[PDB]
Amino acid sequence: TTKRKPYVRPMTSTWWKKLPFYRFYMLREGTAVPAVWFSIELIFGLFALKNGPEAWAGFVDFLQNPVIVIINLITLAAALLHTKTWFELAPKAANIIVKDEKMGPEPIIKSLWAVTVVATIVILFVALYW
Amino acid sequence: AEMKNLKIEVVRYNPEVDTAPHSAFYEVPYDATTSLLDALGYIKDNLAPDLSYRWSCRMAICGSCGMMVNNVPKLACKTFLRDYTDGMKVEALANFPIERDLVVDMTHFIESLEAIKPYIIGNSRTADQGTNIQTPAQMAKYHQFSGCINCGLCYAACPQFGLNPEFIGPAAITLAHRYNEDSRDHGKKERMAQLNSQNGVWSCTFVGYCSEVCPKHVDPAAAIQQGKVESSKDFLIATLKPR
Amino acid sequence: MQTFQADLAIVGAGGAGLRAAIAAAQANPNAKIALISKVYPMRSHTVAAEGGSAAVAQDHDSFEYHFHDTVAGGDWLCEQDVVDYFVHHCPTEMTQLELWGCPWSRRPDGSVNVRRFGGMKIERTWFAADKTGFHMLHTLFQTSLQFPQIQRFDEHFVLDILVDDGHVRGLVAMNMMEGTLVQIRANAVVMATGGAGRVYRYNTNGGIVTGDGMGMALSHGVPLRDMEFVQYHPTGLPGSGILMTEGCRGEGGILVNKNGYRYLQDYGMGPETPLGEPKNKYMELGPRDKVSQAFWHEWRKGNTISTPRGDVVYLDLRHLGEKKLHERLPFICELAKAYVGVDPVKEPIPVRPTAHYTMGGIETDQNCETRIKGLFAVGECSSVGLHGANRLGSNSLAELVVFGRLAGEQATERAATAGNGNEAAIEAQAAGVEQRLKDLVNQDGGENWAKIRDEMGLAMEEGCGIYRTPELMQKTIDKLAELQERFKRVRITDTSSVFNTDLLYTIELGHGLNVAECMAHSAMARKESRGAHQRLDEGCTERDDVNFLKHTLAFRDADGTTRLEYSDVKITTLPPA
Amino acid sequence: MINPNPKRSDEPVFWGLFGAGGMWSAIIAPVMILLVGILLPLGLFPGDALSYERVLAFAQSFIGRVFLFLMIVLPLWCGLHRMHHAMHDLKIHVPAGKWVFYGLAAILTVVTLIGVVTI
Ligand SMILES: Cc1cc2nc3c(=O)[nH]c(=O)nc-3n(C[C@H](O)[C@H](O)[C@H](O)COP(=O)(O)OP(=O)(O)OC[C@H]3O[C@@H](n4cnc5c(N)ncnc54)[C@H](O)[C@@H]3O)c2cc1C
Ligand SMILES: CCCCCCCc1cc(O)c2ccccc2[n+]1[O-]
Ligand SMILES: O=C([O-])CC(=O)C(=O)O
Ligand code: SF4
Ligand code: F3S
Ligand code: FES
Ligand SMILES: [K+]
């Protein structure tokens, strides 16, 4: 019989608390929560919008809390962290050759942020100047 | 002159005596040139002849060196004591069963690498007709992904592999991607089943630590994401083939 | 011992072993091939080669020019019929590697590029950036994964071969993880174990290039040919001995002394060439031996720079430029940064000559076969008679696939016509190996194997280096003999079974001592100067084709003595003069 | 050792959704949270831009219906996909987790669809 006794170290549910690189990963996926929470909020607003001004005002009242204002500010932060990390990661899915050389990610990261900026401006214009 | 000394902690384990791994500590002379691999030889030569570990090239090209240094997967021959004056603890490469001291069972890695058919498939050209024509532009498509030295540090870095020992892993998928992306190969379909498995690219949540530790800058993470894109194109094609 | 049946057993999975395994699987699809190695195949030393591998490719070249380069580079000690076969099959094997995927560097039109190495007038070295060994070895390893005939015994340490009535019948190996002995029966065994550069204190080799295969052959009456010719590479890093490819100079790097002087102009390799344009044959691209000898001469004059790791000269590459450096010397740069802490863009790299390649090895005929029927040797552990007294740069890697293929095929045939042997005799051989192993394990004496290791290394460096004298060679022969006596007083204090490396390094050390004595004795008797073997004593400082245009054969008898015999060199079209 | 004929995973369907959703909430989520979660409730807008009548006028337009749907739904298919996998990362056993998180997505998607064809 073998004299070998392979020792398998166990992996705990707290593995990610160790290294910062893992923590930041957890944090990144964590943005998922405020994001769905915001989708839920929009659904409230959408159905308050349909139930007449009376209900709509009750929605706006909710958004005024102001504990809900904090949660929403946290939500905005989370969303930006998502945008920040999403843009760095997306370029890796493409393998593009520009003159005998594999390029990116910088050219792509720059374009996405350019588009967000323009989008943030066009939406704000459209929703407030008229 | 007078060489400084460093107390290194090495996690020993003898399956014929120990019930579990346990630390030992050794005083090792050193300078600005001393590497972990240099330190381990000094220990085996003067302090504990029963210290076992893998190594060979001494120049970070063979890949047999991997181990944990303060919980970071690294190559002992590319790790230097001058950087660990406040403490250095050495352990066997994470996520692999420990066999004895710093040696771990690499069988899963080997089988994983074998399962993706890492060889040119389906090209009928024969030696007498000369070599294939391939341009810098075509080679650039896979070149970076061919620098893998099978050292396994990416398997130690991946938390997904530690949670799912059946995951074929970062290097294996990168290797598969390297052949899929080579204009001379025609055997992408022979590799997809494994990349489409749940134990394939889909077991990856893009933690990205593998790329961060590659001593050869292969960027296995980029390979996997790209694999996901191909696995997805494959899934559609299959869904649309009522043929 | 558990036994295993195979048509052929290959000891060694580097370039040669792998190319041999594939040839054998393609020559006989039904064969059961046992590929053995003490490290996983991809960790073999082939992985480290950086310059390239030779093969006639340009239109203005000729098989005759590669033929002549090899013969002259070997100072006429090459078996001219083998050299001919070699050059003629290089193109086929480099191309075939390409078919298997090897990513050789290319010309913009997609044809493979080629550069100059070993001083060849017409460039013909194919290359994968400056990671050629890495790419050849992996391509080879990975390609072999598709042949089910090849059954690998990874991390199996072959202890001995089994011989009876002049024919090989298998081998005994140790499953390293398990610590158990195993018997592999085969009628053909190919030795592809590598060189012996680790008997030198400072070298460019991996820890596993210990000369095991050579030692095993010595034990069975097979001689080692031309062992006195040890190739030094002129540019290695102090202490680690790590190699800095000749490619640093083919790209215009310079070698200077403590005065910043390009000393090579005063040793017959002038006139100086402008930083811009380096010329083959001149200055830093001068004859390999003259460049290493210049170092020793500089050292005598006190022109080397003293450092903590030893005296060196400087390999200055700054004037190369980022683009060039990173496009043709990415590896060299990271090695330099990591092990000597130097940026080849900002500072000069400290270097000095280092033991690098073993020319001599297991004696074989033109088909890689040895004097024991069924036993072959290919690759760096052998002597097919290709390199003479000095290997030509980029000929070794070519050799691995050209003769590895030959070995695989010839062994295949040999095992098919072998016929059976005396079973009790064979089994007795196996019981023999096992007993000798217990003997070594039970040996006591309190001697530390590692210090013997260190002394052997120092001896080879002092007595069998760049310049040799009968006083110092003799001193080395005396040292090794002493170290052989001590080896018997070594105690392997680790009696564990799971990956016991203490025991393995101790066996490896045994082969080294044996192998090193053949080198020192071979060198002490060659009362001439030829190729890598250069002597400073009166009446020995020159080449002597009248009395030494012959090969050295070194045998080891059962009484531990090293005896020499001499053989003739096959000439075909290029007589010496 | 390793299954020679593994079952093709269905992840490419959720991954794809999650991909489009992750890209949509990367580009458009920040501004929307600004307007709705902050500017709206704080009166920080000119005149009657974000007044009931104006929002309703917008939500009832075609482009507004499509926009509200996608703004609500794409992010959901992204976030639920991540919470699904977070469960595994955290080693939290969730029975029929694939049906739970993706079902919730589908339920909420339907609920939203009803909403933009109007209540
Ligand atoms: C740093 C460096 C760079 C070089 N660059 C070049 C170059 O650019 N061009 C060129 O032409 N040449 C070059 N060379 C020389 C050439 O690379 C080598 O001569 C060649 O690679 C040797 O290959 P090999 O097949 O004989 O075996 P190796 O690659 O040395 O492998 C030997 C095999 O035998 C196995 N083995 C050994 N002993 C045992 C045992 N006891 N039991 C079981 N298995 C065993 C090992 O595990 C291994 O698998 C270089 C050499 C070095 C050191
Ligand atoms: C085309 C853009 C794709 C970029 C997506 C980012 C990669 C990515 C990031 C994640 O957090 C994941 C978590 C679970 C499963 C898959 C994941 N993927 O693929
Ligand atoms: O070292 C190099 O780059 C080339 C050389 O001489 C060899 O063939 O080993
Ligand atoms: S990808 Fe990088 S880390 Fe992973 S095995 Fe290959 S070389 Fe090592
Ligand atoms: S760390 Fe693991 S999760 Fe994917 S990005 Fe690398 S394989
Ligand atoms: S010894 Fe080769 S990778 Fe470290
Ligand atoms: K040799």
User: What residue type is assigned to position C148 of the chain?
Assistant: P
**Residue B54 beta carbon below 6 angstroms from any ligand 6 atom:** no
Q: CB neighbours of C14 closer than 8 A, spacing ≥ 6?
A: C41, C44, C45, C46, C137, C192, C194, C379, C380, C400
How is residue C30 written in tokens?
A: 């039904």
3-state secondary structure of A126: helix
Q: CB neighbours of C571 closer than 8 A, spacing ≥ 6?
A: C80
Spatial separation of the C-alpha atoms in residues C32 and C4, rounded to whole Å: 10
Contact with chain C for residue A102, Cβ under 8 A: no
Q: What 8-state DSSP symbol labels residue C158?
A: E
Spatial separation of the C-alpha atoms in residues D98 and D93, rounded to whole Å: 11
Euclidean distance between the first and final Cα of chain B, in Å?
79
- The reply to whether B137 and B45 lie within a common domain is no
Domain that residue B146 falls in: 106-243
Angle in degrees, 0-180, between the axes of helices D62-89 and A32-50, rounded to the nearest 10: 150
Spatial separation of the C-alpha atoms in residues C540 and D63, rounded to whole Å: 97
| Residue B32 Cα to ligand 3 middle (Å) | 28
- The reply to whether C275 and C368 lie within a common domain is no
Residues with CB under 5 A from ligand 7 (ion): C 358, 361
3-state secondary structure of A58: helix
Spatial separation of the C-alpha atoms in residues A55 and C107, rounded to whole Å: 72
Single residue among B45, B75, B105 that ends a domain in this structure? B105
- The reply to whether B150 and B225 lie within a common domain is yes
| Residue whose CA lies nearest to ligand 1 atom number 33 | C12
CATH class held by domain A1-130: mainly alpha
Single residue among C352, C372, C390 that ends a domain in this structure? C352
Q: Quickly count: other Cβ atoms within 10 Å of residue C474's Cβ.
A: 13
Q: Quickly count: other Cβ atoms within 10 Å of residue C437's Cβ.
A: 17
Q: CB neighbours of C377 closer than 8 A, spacing ≥ 6?
A: C190, C191, C192, C213, C217, C361, C362, C364, C368, C370, C383, C407
Tell which residue, C379, C401, C394, has the closest CA to residue C94: C401
Residue linked to tokens 């831009």? D49
- The reply to whether B62 and B149 lie within a common domain is no
CATH for C326: 3.90.700.10
- The reply to whether C30 and C148 lie within a common domain is yes
Q: What 8-state DSSP symbol labels residue D118?
A: -
CATH for D18: 1.20.1300.10
Q: CB neighbours of C576 closer than 8 A, spacing ≥ 6?
A: C76, C545, C549
- The reply to whether B18 and B134 lie within a common domain is no
Domain that residue D104 falls in: 1-119
- The reply to whether B175 and B233 lie within a common domain is yes
Domain that residue C565 falls in: 543-577
Contact with chain C for residue A99, Cβ under 8 A: no
Spatial separation of the C-alpha atoms in residues B135 and D118, rounded to whole Å: 58
Q: CB neighbours of C466 closer than 8 A, spacing ≥ 6?
A: C232, C292, C293, C295, C296, C353, C534
| Residue whose CA lies nearest to ligand 5 atom number 7 | B170
Decide: B65 and B37 in contact? Cβ < 8 Å: yes
What is the least distance, in Å, from the CA of A88 to any CA of chain B?
11
- The reply to whether C9 and C89 lie within a common domain is yes
Q: Give the pairing of strands B22-30 and B4-12.
A: antiparallel
Spatial separation of the C-alpha atoms in residues C365 and B183, rounded to whole Å: 41
How many folded domains does chain B comprise?
Answer: 2
Contact with chain B for residue A92, Cβ under 8 A: yes
Single residue among B105, B139, B158 that ends a domain in this structure? B105
Spatial separation of the C-alpha atoms in residues C390 and C392, rounded to whole Å: 6
3-state secondary structure of C129: coil
Single residue among B72, B105, B138 that ends a domain in this structure? B105
Tell which residue, C193, C508, C470, C248, has the closest CA to residue C358: C193
3-state secondary structure of C353: strand
| Residue B118 Cα to ligand 3 middle (Å) | 28
Tell which residue, B127, B184, B140, B147, has the closest CA to residue C55: B127
Q: Quickly count: other Cβ atoms within 10 Å of residue B87's Cβ.
A: 10
Give me the residues of C, 143-202, that contact A with CB < 8 A.
177-179
- The reply to whether C343 and C245 lie within a common domain is yes
Angle in degrees, 0-180, between the axes of helices B36-46 and C449-463, rounded to the nearest 10: 120
How many folded domains does chain C comprise?
Answer: 4
Out of D41, D52, D80, the one facing A56 most closely (by C-beta) is D52
Write the DSSP string, C182-243.
EEEE-S-EEE-----GGGSSSBSS-TT-S-HHHHHHHTTT--EESTT-EEEEEEE-TTT--B
Q: Quickly count: other Cβ atoms within 10 Å of residue B152's Cβ.
A: 26
- Calculate the CA C344 to chain-centre distance: 28
Q: Give the pairing of strands C375-377 and C189-191.
A: parallel
Mutate to test the pocket of ligand 5, among B175, B198, B224 (most ligand atoms within 8 A of CB): B224
Spatial separation of the C-alpha atoms in residues A117 and A130, rounded to whole Å: 20
> DSSP alpha helices (H): ranges in chain B?
36-46, 107-115, 136-140, 153-157, 159-163, 170-180, 189-196, 209-213, 220-239
**Residue B204 beta carbon below 6 angstroms from any ligand 4 atom:** no
**Residue B60 beta carbon below 6 angstroms from any ligand 6 atom:** yes
Q: What angle do CA C148, C149, C152 make, to 5 degrees?
A: 85
Decide: C558 and C227 in contact? Cβ < 8 Å: no
Q: Which atom of ligand 5 is nearest to the CA of B159?
A: 2
- The reply to whether C369 and C495 lie within a common domain is no
Breaks, C-N > 2.5 A, in chain C lie after none
Write the DSSP string, C272-339.
---SS---TTSGGGS-HHHHHHHHHHHHHHT-SEEETTEEEEEEE-GGG-HHHHHHH-HHHHHHHHHH
Tell which residue, C218, C536, C540, has the closest CA to residue C360: C218
CATH for C373: 3.50.50.60
CA distances for A19 relative to B67, B72, B209, C221, angstroms: 17, 9, 10, 59
CA distances for A37 relative to A81, C348, D93, angstroms: 16, 60, 22
| Residue whose CA lies nearest to ligand 2 atom number 4 | A90
Contact with chain D for residue A44, Cβ under 8 A: no
All partners of chain D with 3 or more CB pairs under 8 angstroms:
A, B
CA distances for C99 relative to B144, C95, C96, angstroms: 19, 6, 5
Spatial separation of the C-alpha atoms in residues C454 and C460, rounded to whole Å: 10
Q: CB neighbours of A11 closer than 8 A, spacing ≥ 6?
A: B159, B162, B163
Spatial separation of the C-alpha atoms in residues C402 and C112, rounded to whole Å: 19
Spatial separation of the C-alpha atoms in residues A59 and A48, rounded to whole Å: 7
Spatial separation of the C-alpha atoms in residues C2 and B74, rounded to whole Å: 37
- The reply to whether B146 and B208 lie within a common domain is yes
Beta bridge partners of B88: B8
Spatial separation of the C-alpha atoms in residues C81 and C98, rounded to whole Å: 27
Q: Give the pairing of strands C361-363 and C382-383.
A: parallel
Residues of chain A positioned with their CB less than 8 A from the CB of C175 = none
